[PDB]
RNA sequence: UUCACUUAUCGAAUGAAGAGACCAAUGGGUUUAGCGUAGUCUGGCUAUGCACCGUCUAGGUU
RNA sequence: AAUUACCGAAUCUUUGAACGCAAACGGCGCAUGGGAGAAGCUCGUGUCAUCCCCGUGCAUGCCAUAUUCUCAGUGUCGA
RNA sequence: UUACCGCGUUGUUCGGAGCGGGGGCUCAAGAUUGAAAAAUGCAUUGUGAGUUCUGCGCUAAAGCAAAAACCUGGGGU
RNA sequence: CACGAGUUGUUCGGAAACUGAGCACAACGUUAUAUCGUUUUGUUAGGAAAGUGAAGGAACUGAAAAGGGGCAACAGAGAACCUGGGAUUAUAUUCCAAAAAGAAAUUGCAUGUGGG
């Protein structure tokens, strides 16, 4: 037969990322000196949109530490944020909307967005359009913090990963319903080349696994097994059940 | 009208002066590596046959051994055309200061402590202990060949002095033997290597005391 | 090489020798008195040449294909002492360039054609 | 096999842009081993164990 | 000799390994040596700014070298 | 100085964070007077309709490319 | 089919001289094999990639400036000129001659005037 779908996106040629309106990378400020031992204040310059994100991105104007100089940076705006408020970064901030802070600093219970997973990474846990975290406990014995994840699961992190406090913007947004193919399209347009989606079971067996027949059928178990190669790895994948769920929803996750 | 106007260097405030930035810059790749070998042969375990080489000479005995081969130091160009148109000298060059070590014609040696490949050297006081040849190991190979004449020298062997210097050499031999030829035991013994950083044994010291 | 403030070294600052000019690796003998035949081929005689020399104070010649308006006028006065106040230039279809060289009103082209012998 | 170490190795950040100590050892020395006490070793002196010395010095605030 | 044959002296446009930088461009440079220039300046000359033309050098890598060229290193020493 | 009323568009609005009246500063697009220009071209000077550049300032889970080149200021020189 | 002719620019289009979706020289890595890969999400390369302002006592000399070189739009950005001609057999915002039929705009370098 012929290359499945799935593994030709792989060599990503016209699966790329669309992006030549996007503003860049949406990041904290970088974790120096001045972050460490005291705190730097700046101010919320404006707030855009950005094709194919769903949240807000707030533009920060900063005062160079070493350099007679301006710095700006882009960073996803919390709900709440306006032009003109001042945002303070490092250890001796204040506790407000929009403030960035250490992890061991932030009181046990609160609401925080734009986490760091290690210490440096520059923010990389709930960024998407309504999430957030909730800070459970500290552990001044080992120096680690853990959180609830937006998924549910618990993570444990360094206390000295920063956080902001608040919940990022745009929330609500899955709750219209679309009504129409070329909302579909004008949102899949600003992502990736992804949409429409055909069925297995409509191609021919010389293209996936699940093609062919008189009826429109699968002939096997759609459940595979972790172990199988690329090509054969369509379906459900390494389930541990399957059916409408009857009582409470597990997490998932490994 | 002259006044102090201060300025302020703490966090926010006034843009700092030029600060030195030697210790956290990042050098060219030859620095690096050439430092960080230095640290790797502090921090590993060093077998006794090349840790017998971080133990060398006083500086006073030094300069009198290199003064004494700067005296009897070998002949140059200019000088031997100058002769031999109508001397005793010290013995320089691995191969022939080896046949010098196995005869019995050396009477002192001095080796280098710092060769790069060190196998040149490394058999060297092994063989000079099993003969009965008195040996130092000193500090500097281009200050043995800044003795001798040359850009450097890996040893050099004395053989013959005269009576002027034999009280020296006498003396030379007796504390030179006070410190190689006479402790041969715990050399061979001896491991070294294996040094903490500071860094680590300031933490260390910190915490035994905070657990004490 | 005492103090840094910058985050990274860069290549310090040495003295360079500057280039010595060599012999020249050119022998043949080239004139300097020449030069002009080559830039200038010969003329052009027909109606339209005819008429511009009548009306417009113009010659029209046939000139080397890789020279310029500039080369052009200087040749123009060395050949025949004459000053020119204006040269456009066409390359033709078959590959030769063609100009039209007008004279100062001190000058009579039809006095220069015949002295070319047009 | 469980505990500790850091230099191999692995991960991240940065334009390699401010690590640690000075608050003193279970630390280092003949080119920061100088000097005692007690054993052991070959006459120039070492080794082991303990004691003192040098390296070793500053400061916001209370 | 506008004859033939052979060869020792020469000439040898634009390219191409193509190598100053480019290229569906007869394009654009840096250093250096020349040329022409009834602009201006000066006593028909001499000189000449901007513009124009011509010769030579200028790729990367590696080897050797510097009457002993200029440097860099919390690499090893020693003043 | 406005008493929740007043201003304004074909149209979804503006006002003690300054409506309206008097007098002014400025910007954009037009008009007019003249030089060009009659020395040229060929053998008048008024209304109504249509069309551009312009102005009316700036669908959406879709929200309006970048750089050279240039302009103005803050400071020192 | 034969012979002879015809395309004129300081300003028009391009280049000189922008960046885009993108390409891939150097450097490095990989491969028995470079004819392979990375190379714009600020951005080469274990990575020393800056070559000249002001200077002072006519050229030389060297302080301060992280992030190598280049290409890719004749419909995007950019771009100083308009009419009349009795001026061709065929070209013209390209030709016309001292009353330039004429009237302008702009670039470089010089010279006088005024101001400074
Ligand atoms: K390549
Ligand atoms: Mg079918
Ligand atoms: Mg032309
Ligand atoms: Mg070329
Ligand atoms: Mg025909
Ligand atoms: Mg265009
Ligand atoms: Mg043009
Ligand atoms: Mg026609
Ligand atoms: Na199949
Ligand atoms: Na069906
Ligand atoms: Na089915
Ligand atoms: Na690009
Ligand atoms: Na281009």
Redesign the interface.
């Given at each position: 037969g012929k290359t499945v779908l799935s593994c030709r996106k792989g060599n990503g040629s016209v699966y790329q990322v669309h992006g030549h309106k996007r503003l860049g990378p949406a990041k904290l400020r970088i974790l120096d000196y001045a972050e460490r031992h005291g705190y730097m204040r700046g101010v919320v310059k404006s707030i855009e949109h950005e094709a194919g994100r769903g949240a807000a991105l707030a533009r920060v104007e900063f005062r160079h530490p070493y350099k007679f100089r301006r710095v700006k940076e882009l960073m996803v705006a919390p709900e709440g944020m306006f032009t003109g408020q001042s945002v303070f970064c490092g250890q001796k901030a204040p506790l407000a909307i929009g403030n960035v802070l250490p992890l061991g600093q932030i009181t046990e219970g609160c609401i925080v967005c734009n986490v760091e997973a290690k210490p440096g990474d520059r923010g990389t846990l709930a960024r998407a359009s309504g999430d957030y975290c909730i800070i459970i406990s500290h552990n001044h014995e080992t120096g680690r913090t853990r959180l609830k994840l937006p998924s549910g699961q618990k993570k444990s992190v360094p206390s000295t990963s920063r956080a902001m406090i608040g919940i990022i913007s745009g929330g609500g947004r899955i709750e219209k319903p679309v009504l129409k193919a070329g909302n579909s399209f004008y949102r899949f347009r600003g992502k990736r080349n992804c949409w429409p989606k055909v069925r297995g079971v409509a191609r021919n067996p010389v293209e996936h696994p699940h093609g062919g027949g008189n009826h429109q059928h699968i002939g096997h178990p759609s459940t595979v097994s972790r172990h199988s190669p690329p090509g054969q790895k369509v379906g459900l994948i390494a389930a541990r059940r399957t059916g409408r769920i009857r009582g409470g929803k597990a997490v998932k996750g490994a | 009208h002259f006044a102090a106007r201060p300025k302020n260097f703490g966090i926010g405030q006034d843009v700092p002066y030029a600060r030195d930035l030697s210790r956290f810059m990042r050098w060219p790749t030859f620095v690096t590596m050439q430092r960080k070998k230095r640290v790797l042969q502090r921090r590993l375990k060093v077998p006794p046959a090349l840790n017998q080489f971080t133990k060398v000479l006083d500086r006073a005995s030094r300069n009198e051994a290199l003064k004494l081969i700067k005296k009897y130091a070998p002949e140059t160009r200019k000088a031997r055309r100058e002769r031999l148109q109508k001397p005793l000298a010290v013995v320089t060059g691995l191969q022939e200061v080896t046949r010098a070590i196995e005869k019995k014609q050396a009477r002192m040696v001095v080796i280098a402590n710092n060769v790069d490949p060190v196998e040149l050297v490394l058999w060297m006081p092994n063989l000079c202990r099993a003969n009965k040849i008195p040996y130092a190991i000193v500090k500097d190979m281009a200050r043995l060949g800044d003795a001798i004449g040359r850009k450097t020298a890996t040893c050099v062997a004395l053989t013959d002095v005269n009576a002027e210097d034999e009280a020296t050499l006498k003396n030379l031999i007796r504390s030179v033997n006070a410190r190689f030829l006479s402790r041969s035991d715990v050399i061979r013994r001896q491991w070294g290597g294996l040094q903490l950083s500071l860094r680590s044994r300031a933490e260390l010291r910190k915490k035994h005391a905070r657990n004490a | 090489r005492k103090?840094?403030?910058?985050?990274?070294?860069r290549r310090p600052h040495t003295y360079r020798k500057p280039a010595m000019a060599k012999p020249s690796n050119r022998v043949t003998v080239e004139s300097k008195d020449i030069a002009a035949f080559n830039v200038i081929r010969y003329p052009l005689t027909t109606d339209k040449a005819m008429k511009k020399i009548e009306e417009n104070n113009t010659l029209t010649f046939i000139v080397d294909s890789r020279a310029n308006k500039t080369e052009i006028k200087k040749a123009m006065r060395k050949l025949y002492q004459v000053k020119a106040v204006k040269v456009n230039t066409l390359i033709r279809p078959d590959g030769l360039k063609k100009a039209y060289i007008r004279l100062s009103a001190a000058h009579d082209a039809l006095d220069t054609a015949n002295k070319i012998g047009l």
């Open positions: - | - | 103090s840094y403030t910058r985050p990274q070294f």
